[PDB]
Amino acid sequence: RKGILGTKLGMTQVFDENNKVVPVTVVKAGPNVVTRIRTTERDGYSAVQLAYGEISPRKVIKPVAGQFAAAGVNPRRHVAELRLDDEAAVAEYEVGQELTAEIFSDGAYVDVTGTSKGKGFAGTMKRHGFRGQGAAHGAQAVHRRPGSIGTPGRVFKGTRMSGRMGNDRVTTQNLKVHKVDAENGVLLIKGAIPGRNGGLVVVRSAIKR
Amino acid sequence: PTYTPKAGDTTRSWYVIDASDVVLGRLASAAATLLRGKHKPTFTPNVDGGDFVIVINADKIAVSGDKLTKKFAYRHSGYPGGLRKRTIGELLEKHPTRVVENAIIGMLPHNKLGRQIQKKLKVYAGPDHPHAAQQPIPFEIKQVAQ
């Protein structure tokens, strides 16, 4: 399973060779530098840690700067881990190695992971798709409230009631990569990927396809 | 009046119990008695003057009957339909130590003092333990003949 860190730029329109339209989301799969190797003999699990983003050296605090110096690379803004399956899979990464966009190929299926947009304090109508009550025929101030809550006289756990919504990590599966522009380090992914423009995303080879 | 332990009176010793081919209930009761401090003449229900207990070869333990595949360990998450059950077989092959831990914990009091006593029980599926530094005394389950 390959992987890379990127940034959501926006969505646009392209046409394939059958003249059909493809709505594509542009992701800046920028250069990532491998900072640490997680090994079973040391950490108990095999994983690779990638750094992304450009940040001023005067902005990083001392612990982070020390970690990056121990790695041997200049600091970056964002750090994340890719969990592999076994040592044979992680043997192909070594610290300081640079990953760019061309690890993916045209037509590949990818898994983009991002943080959903925030929606604030949301009612059950919006948070859970509850059907409302009547807007007329005598309904009294119940046009949007959940209604019943339903022996022990107890509201069971998991009640789908109102609350804060959004701002959760979301994975969209089996997205097709329409084009891999190597010059700009840009992936053209058919479909809509989570989060707002300028947010961090993780692009991974699909686990299913 | 009756003797009462003071601040510095309690002394602890470490026993290591080999659970290979030992009846689960028997070992659980012996370890519970050891943890409670019932074997000491200075015993007092108020104080946890027990001893630290190490149990090795937890996976080799003996279960009679057909309880290996017919006795269930239950737990409820609290959500509706959150009841999960595992027989002693899969519990043993997945978390070997949990069977002995549950058995021993069920046989000692359910107060806060029981919670403090639980801290003095260490069980391990392997034939060895990392507590060699304390020099535990090997302990064998005998019966006082009357």
């Binding site: - | 003797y3 019932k38 000491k40 003449p41 009357q146």
Partner: protein
């Protein structure tokens, strides 16, 4: 009971042996002996052992 099992005898057999031996010390002072002076308790255990029948399960 704890102190008697420390001397390889059960509490009930110890009490029966003490009764047969005729010693008239009660449980309060028996516990006092067990906690304070283990030597006296061991001696009492021996005298109770002597006072017991040879086959306790005999009719």
């Amino acid at each position: 009971n704890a102190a008697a099992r420390a001397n390889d005898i059960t509490y009930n057999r110890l009490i029966q042996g003490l009764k047969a031996a005729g010693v008239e010390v009660d449980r309060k002072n028996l516990a006092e002996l067990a906690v304070s002076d283990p030597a006296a308790f061991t001696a009492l255990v021996d005298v109770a052992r002597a006072a017991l029948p040879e086959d306790v399960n005999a009719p």
